[PDB]
Paper text:
Ribosome biogenesis is a highly coordinated and complex process that requires numerous assembly factors that ensure prompt and flawless maturation of ribosomal subunits. [name] has been identified as a bacterial cold shock response protein required for the efficient processing of the [name] 5′ end during the assembly of the 30S ribosomal subunit. Here, we report cryo-EM structures of 30S assembly intermediates accumulated in an [name] null [name] strain. Cryo-EM analysis of Δ[name] 30S particles revealing the accumulation of two predominant classes of early and late intermediates allowed us to suggest that [name] participates in two stages of 30S subunit assembly and is more deeply involved in the maturation process than previously thought.
Particles of classes E (12%) and F (39%) conform to more mature assembly intermediates with well-resolved body, platform, and head domains. Moreover, the head in the map for class E tilts backward relative to the body compared to class F. The head domain is well resolved in the map for class F, and only the densities for proteins S3, S7, and S13 are weak and the density for S10 is fragmented. In addition to the appearance of the head domain, the density for helix 44 of the 3′ minor domain (nts 1407–1494) is ordered and well-resolved in the maps for these two classes, although the map lacks the clear density for the flanking 1398–1406 and 1495–1498 16S RNA regions. However, the reconstruction revealed significant distortion of the overall structure of the 3′ minor domain, including helix 44. In particular, the upper segment of helix 44, which is responsible for tRNA binding, is displaced outward and protrudes from the interface side of the 30S subunit that is in contact with the 50S subunit. Moreover, in the map for class F, the head of the pre-30S intermediate tilts backward by 10° compared to the wild-type 30S subunit. Density for protein S2 is clearly determined only in the map for Δ[name] pre-30S particles of class F. This is in good agreement with previous cryo-EM studies on the immature 30S ΔyjeQ subunits where the map for the structure with helix 44 close to its native position showed S2 density similar to that in the mature structure. These data are consistent with the interpretation we propose that the most developed 30S particles of class F represent an immature pre-30S subunit that is rather close to the mature state. Our data show that the top part of helix 44 is displaced and protrudes from the interface side of the 30S subunit, blocking the final formation of the decoding center and joining of the 50S subunit. The presence of almost mature intermediates (class F) with displaced helix 44 confirms this assumption.
Author numbering:
A (entry chain P): 1 to 82
B (entry chain D): 1 to 205
C (entry chain L): 63 to 123
D (entry chain Q): 3 to 82
E (entry chain T): 2 to 86
The structure:
RNA sequence: CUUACCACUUUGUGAUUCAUGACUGGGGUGAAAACAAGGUAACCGUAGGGGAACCUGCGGUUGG
RNA sequence: UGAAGAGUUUGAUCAUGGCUCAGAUUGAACGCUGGCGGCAGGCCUAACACAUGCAAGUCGAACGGUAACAGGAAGAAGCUUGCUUCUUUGCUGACGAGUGGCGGACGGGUGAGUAAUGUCUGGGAAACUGCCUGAUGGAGGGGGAUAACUACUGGAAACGGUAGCUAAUACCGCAUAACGUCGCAAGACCAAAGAGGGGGACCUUCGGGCCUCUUGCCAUCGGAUGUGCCCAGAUGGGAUUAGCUAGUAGGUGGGGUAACGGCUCACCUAGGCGACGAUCCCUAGCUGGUCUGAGAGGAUGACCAGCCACACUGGAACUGAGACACGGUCCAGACUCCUACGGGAGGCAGCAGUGGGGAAUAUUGCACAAUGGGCGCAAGCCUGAUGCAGCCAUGCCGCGUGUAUGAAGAAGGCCUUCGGGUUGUAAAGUACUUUCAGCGGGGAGGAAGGGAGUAAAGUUAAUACCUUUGCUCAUUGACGUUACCCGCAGAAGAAGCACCGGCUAACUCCGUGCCAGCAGCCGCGGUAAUACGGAGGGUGCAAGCGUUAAUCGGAAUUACUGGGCGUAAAGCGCACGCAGGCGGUUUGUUAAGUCAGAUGUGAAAUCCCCGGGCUCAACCUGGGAACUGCAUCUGAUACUGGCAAG
């Protein structure tokens, strides 16, 4: 099943996340279908902690892709900031 | 690791004066310049093609106080940049925070400059930087922290600094002790006799 | 066939040693070089230059 | 009309099927010479409409047997 | 070793027993249709087919066999019956 | 219960290696004068004699 | 943005030609030395054998239940005014065992096998696809069981057997039935399961019915995802492997499969593959990539990502959407373990760890706080994935180990032509500083969330319940005494290793005497010997430095780019000749090569450019470029090919 989840990249204790459309059976940051944005948690004044490009998320949800809770929280934040 | 040996014997092997023993006493009255620094100092120093490339590379390193691993990396980055590699390399060497603190007067020798930088007593754009190889860019503001503006050594270094030529490419204030890196110095205003082509030939094989 | 280099010796008729490459301009067939200080071999005695090549440890001075 | 490889019959002795060799002129990867490479290829003709030396078009289809996945399209040169 | 494996093994034995019973019965009926075809009879074979058919369709309903297999048995057997005509 | 297939298994027959074996094969070890003019150019193939390496026959070459 | 050479054959020369050296690299190892941090990496060997723990569960909102815990309702008591003691009650929260569902096919390991249907690139047609999603419709009515349980009950045990009992979202009919399957058609045939919350009114056999919402169930058709299958090209070496093949190759029918198919069978035909390398032997996981190189190439495939294959060895299936199943089954081996000698049990190529091999590779750690995954409405539970921590200079990167001045130019050492020189501003002493380590104190960020209370007539018994948003409150960090900041003394705690004849930067004295030794090569050593050992000095590099191994380079030394064959190695003794390679000239045509444009694809990472964040750097990251290829379409037609005509 297709879920939009975070793939943990970055360095140790400096997490960076790729927002990736994936088949849910793959490893967290293994085989994926598509990258749809990124999330940088440790960026406070540091600029652009989150880019999502929500047209593709819309397209994939319209096909029965579930969201992880963290990506859903990130989508609320991006929409509110707009 | 720095180099912690005798400063003048390093200059005497290079022949020319290296500004790494600086102040009032005007070496060759400090101690016996112009004999290579050992038991066979008087022996003739005539040396090969690879010896002169080596000698100048060694001299540039001894001036700035950079070791061979970083100097090799400097050369790699300079040879990656666009433009001639030799002035790329001298500019990378002169954009070093160690050096910039020295050249802005406050800091007697580049080792005293480094003593200051390392000891949490310099601010680049209003925050403490204690890396000597930190690169200063055009329009940083290097300044002594307030806690160290009362230091007697920086004040003393300032006077014996306008006797030294003041670089054009950077502008400093001594009252409010603070400076400004204006632009990357060109090869021309780097007042020196460095023959950077033998250096680039050294690592080019 | 191995060469026991260095200025002295302690090897015997069964001792267990470590060998490394490098031949000697000796009679044909010598291309290995015993490592001094590695196993049953010992660093040569009263050696004070190129010490690390003979397994002799730094004199306390 | 999908790909229509265009070749020449080399054996007509299996019933309802021919063997068709395709010449390609490829450049040698290291030496840069243009060499000739052959691809023999079991094809299906239902009507035994082909004879050795004929020049034939084939297209790719579903596998008709072990090593038979091409079918005859036309005979372009019924060479005798 | 694992407890869900332990349960899943005896569940497979029970499922396997049920499945063997059901697909043997399905094969009994299919082979009765056949047995009628090589006897050369059209009425006997049509009766056999029409009692085979609900069995194969219900067993493909519950997943014992695939629908494709059900469509296969029915297609084959009607072809045989109709050439038998 | 009984067919069909089959892994393994046993047998035979084969191929293929592994070791070792007398031997090999004796490598030995120990024991019973002339530098192209110069004790008879420099070679090539081949055949002989003998512990051989040499010499000789037959053809050939100049790289005498 | 890109390319260096030197030494050694001679009495000397110039060629040839090998050897050797200077570079970069590494999953390294070893020897000597070793401060701090950051970030990474760490069994390459025995797919050797494995003690111990852990790595896969979960769901009471499917079910009988209720062992166990805690509650309620009691009862009988002690009698505190009912304070606590026994029995009963699933009445309840909950929940061991059991049934059922879903998960256990993922995630994690390894690289044995595999030389090509494995992989890569590019196409294809004949398939299926749990969960997710869209649409449409259905969801009626019965039955018989059975685990648990009870009582026996064998067995050392593992594991059972007998009799009775019992539910369901278990199972089985029946109905119902296209948009489904079979059928040319008529027709025929095919399905399901509830549970939960709340409730006005009404009814109630007082169980509930009824209402409403939520979720699940069945069918069909799509999506998405995943998987199966086909084709072409490519992807080692060996010809001191030249023939190979009877489901062999094809064809018709059966059968089988989700699907096509020699997949299988019966018959028929007698083919198929092979010198453009079949077959056989050997070696090998493949790719993105990595290293090296100016490049072309070579060498590789550790980490990370993708694909394959394996799970003690060999068979086989079952169950299931998916397996021919790492922590599933059985049967055959081989081992190990148990045994009451009847018979049993097991599989670290999960994490850690042990033995063993080895030159060589780490903890039997913490946590689910984060990101994922399984189950669950959820709360949550599980998760050796993962996040971290430990260890190790293994690499990379950063920073320390002080700074300024200081000539008695000190002692001391070493060389002295005995004048001195050198170590050497070096030290000392004077001032100065306090990074980092130490001590104290503050103190981010990784935390989003979830829990409880708060409107929309949301939805409708309208208030319910539930949903979204509404705020409000309290709460969630393994790392962790975090990063970081501040104070505190005090230079205080913090340099080594190689080399010094030439290549190759850097030399003197002593000793030794072709010994001892050195050595990469040249070579050195028989009284000096700048070459061996010590010293003093110097050079290089520096928390490292050397050595060994190994790969590319240098090597144009397999030469495509980019070499040669008179005598240096090298023209077959000589022809003829098939395959093959190559092919005078002019038209025409085609458009295969070729060229051009387009399009699609060329995973992400990596590499490169411009930026951004970490105090800098390494590292991380954004965008781009690149991926030099493959295919398809359109066009060109000089040249090569084809075809035609000369």
């Amino acid at each position: 099943m297709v879920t939009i989840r975070l793939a943990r990249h970055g360095a140790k204790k400096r997490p960076f996340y790729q927002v990736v459309v994936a088949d849910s059976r793959n490893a967290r940051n293994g085989r994926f279908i598509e990258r749809v944005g990124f999330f940088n948690p440790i960026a406070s004044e540091k600029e652009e902690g989150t880019r999502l490009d929500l047209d593709r998320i819309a397209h994939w949800v319209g096909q029965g892709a579930t969201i992880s809770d963290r990506v859903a929280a990130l989508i609320k934040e991006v929409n509110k900031a707009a | 690791a720095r180099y912690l040996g005798p400063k003048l014997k390093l200059s005497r092997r290079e022949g020319t004066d290296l500004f790494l023993k600086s102040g009032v006493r005007a070496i060759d009255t400090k101690c016996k310049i112009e004999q290579a620094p050992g038991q066979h100092g008087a022996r003739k120093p005539r040396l090969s093609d690879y010896g002169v490339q080596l000698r100048e590379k060694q001299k540039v390193r001894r001036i700035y106080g950079v070791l061979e691993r970083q100097f090799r990396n400097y050369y790699k980055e300079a040879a990656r940049l666009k433009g001639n590699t030799g002035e790329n390399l001298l500019a990378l060497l002169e954009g070093r925070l160690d050096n910039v603190v020295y050249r802005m007067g406050f800091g007697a020798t580049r080792a005293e400059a480094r003593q200051l930088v390392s000891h949490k007593a310099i601010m680049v754009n209003g925050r403490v930087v204690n890396i000597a190889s930190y690169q200063v860019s055009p329009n940083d503001v290097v300044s002594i922290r307030e806690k160290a503006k009362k230091q007697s050594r920086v004040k003393a270094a300032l006077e014996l600094a306008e006797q030294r030529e003041k670089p054009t490419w950077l502008e400093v204030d001594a009252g409010k002790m603070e400076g400004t890196f204006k632009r990357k110095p060109e090869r021309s205003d780097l007042s020196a006799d460095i023959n950077e082509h033998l250096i680039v030939e050294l690592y080019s094989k | 066939t191995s060469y026991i280099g260095g200025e002295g010796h302690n090897l015997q008729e069964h001792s267990v040693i470590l060998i490394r490459g490098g031949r000697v301009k000796d009679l044909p067939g010598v291309r290995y070089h015993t490592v001094r200080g590695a196993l049953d071999c010992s660093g040569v005695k009263d050696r004070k230059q190129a010490r690390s090549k003979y397994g002799v440890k730094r004199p306390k001075a | 009309k999908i790909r229509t490889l265009q070749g020449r019959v080399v054996s007509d002795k299996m019933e309802k099927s021919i063997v068709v060799a395709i010449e390609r002129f490829v450049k040698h990867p290291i030496y840069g010479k243009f060499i000739k490479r052959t691809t023999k290829l079991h094809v299906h003709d239902e009507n035994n409409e082909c004879g050795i030396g004929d020049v034939v078009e084939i297209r790719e289809c579903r596998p008709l047997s072990k090593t038979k996945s091409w079918t005859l399209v036309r005979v372009v040169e019924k060479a005798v | 070793n694992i407890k869900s494996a332990k349960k899943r093994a005896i569940q497979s034995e029970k499922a396997r027993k049920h499945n063997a019973s059901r697909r043997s019965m399905m094969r009994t009926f299919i082979k009765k249709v056949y047995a009628a075809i090589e006897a050369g009879d059209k009425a006997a074979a049509q009766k056999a087919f029409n009692e085979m058919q609900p069995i194969v369709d219900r067993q493909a309903a519950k997943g014992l066999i695939h629908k494709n297999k059900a469509a296969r048995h029915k297609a084959n057997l009607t072809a045989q019956i109709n050439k038998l005509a």
